[PDB]
Amino acid sequence: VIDPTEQLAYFPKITFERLKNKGKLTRNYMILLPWQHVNRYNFVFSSTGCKVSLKTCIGKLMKDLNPKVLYFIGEGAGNWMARTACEYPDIKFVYRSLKDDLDHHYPLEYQRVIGELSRIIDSGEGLSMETTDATQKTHWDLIHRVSKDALLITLCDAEFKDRDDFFKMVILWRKHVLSCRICTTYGTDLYLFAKYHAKDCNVKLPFFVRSVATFIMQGSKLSGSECYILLTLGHHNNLPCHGEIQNSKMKIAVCNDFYAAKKLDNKSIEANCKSLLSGLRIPINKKELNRQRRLLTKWLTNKANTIIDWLEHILNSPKGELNYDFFEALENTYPNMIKLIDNLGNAEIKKLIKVTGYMLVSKK
């Protein structure tokens, strides 16, 4: 009872830089908050699709290869997969994610965005911990238990402990696509679009693994050196160097603004509000914040005051454009910044930025 293409208007436009396979650009933004969640207010459990998209980044490859099935590894609640389902309404999916008590091993976001799970032909159900671990041979051995389609495009958004774990996955992918009866029959025109953290320089990829392009996303945490690398089979080359990623990341932060989503998913905004502060309603106005202050009259009451104080600061703050120059102003105009980051945890602060972004967009 849901049209996927209609749901796509809840996802924001993606700004990125492609580096196909020199002075330094530096700007020290005094920011302590995860501002990359500013345009992600319409999403609850996972929001990767606000940062990366197959139609925007690898649109041509999607058209040229025309895959019937897509293979997703490492997705939490499957928000990237959810965006893909909206962009490509006839594509079926194979989902894998580590069976942990830590992050989601089920696509909650996909179930929320897309109506049902009928297009997820393999959800990884019944599998053990090692058969869901991309750094283990058995995961790759059982990837074809339902889908008999070759791994034309494999999407990996897994967070690895170290680069050696990343190499374990990349080597296992190569070993699969060069052994597997299904995949070998298709050929060597097979791809792996994986998340990577460019820490070093001149780091060779495994034998017969070649990087086609590097993608630097506006939606990646400003502090790190995260990027998305498009790999294929062929004479090996180097992984992206930390220096290249920095200049690219900087230009996007200094030049570009975050696009807001064309439509506001009021159900999710209400959900993110109640998740941040129980009983918080929309519109978030002076009357709403004074009501929340009144309800308080402990550790939980301390966190609630911290939240209201920030929302009150955003409320009183002038309207600006969604960019890091304005975000730095927002932070360095608030007297209790250090008290905020100390009292609220990482998840609470990401929820706070989602709510903040909704408010900033709602202005004027």
Of 16 and 71, the one with the shorter C-beta distance to Zn ion is 71
96 is in an annotated binding site: no
Choices 97-105, 182-190, 282-290, 346-354 (CB under 5 A): range interacting with Zn ion = 182-190
CB 115 within 8 A of CB 89: no
236 is in an annotated binding site: no
Of 183 and 276, the one with the shorter C-beta distance to Zn ion is 183
Report d(CA 358, CA 275) in Å as an integer.
Answer: 14
Residue 180 interacting with Zn ion (CB under 5 A)? yes
Question: Which position's Cβ is nearest Zn ion?
Answer: 180
Of 182 and 254, the one with the shorter C-beta distance to Zn ion is 182
- What separation in angstroms does the CA of 248 have from each of 55, 111, 200, 202, 257? 21, 34, 16, 18, 15
- Minimum CB–partner distance for residue 149 and Zn ion (Å): 9
Report d(CA 121, CA 289) in Å as an integer.
Answer: 45
Residue pointed to by tokens 């606000």: 50
Of 43 and 193, the one with the shorter C-beta distance to Zn ion is 193
Q: Is 320 helix (H, G, I), strand (E, B) or coil?
A: coil
Choices 37-45, 92-100, 179-187, 326-334 (CB under 5 A): range interacting with Zn ion = 179-187
Of 153 and 349, the one with the shorter C-beta distance to Zn ion is 153
Candidates 347, 338, 343; CA nearest to 298 is 343
Candidates 46, 48, 16, 175; CA nearest to 109 is 46
Residue 192 interacting with Zn ion (CB under 5 A)? no
Of 16 and 193, the one with the shorter C-beta distance to Zn ion is 193
86 is in an annotated binding site: no
Residue 183 interacting with Zn ion (CB under 5 A)? yes
Buried b (16+ CB within 10 A) or exposed e, 250-268: bebbeeeebebbeebbeeb
Choices 67-75, 173-181, 244-252, 253-261 (CB under 5 A): range interacting with Zn ion = 173-181
133 is in an annotated binding site: yes
Torsion of CA 113, 116, 118, 123, to 10 degrees: 70
How many CB atoms sit inside 10 A of residue 15's CB? 16
Residue 146 interacting with Zn ion (CB under 5 A)? no
Candidates 113, 116, 124; CA nearest to 83 is 113
Q: Applying CB under 5 A, which of residues 25, 31, 146, 182 lies at the interface with Zn ion? A: 182
Residue 70 interacting with Zn ion (CB under 5 A)? no
- Which residues form the interface with Zn ion (CB under 5 A)? 180, 182-183
Q: Which residues are annotated as a binding site for Zn(2+)?
A: 144, 176, 180, 183
Q: Which residues are annotated as a binding site for S-adenosyl-L-homocysteine?
A: 46, 78-80, 97, 133-134, 159
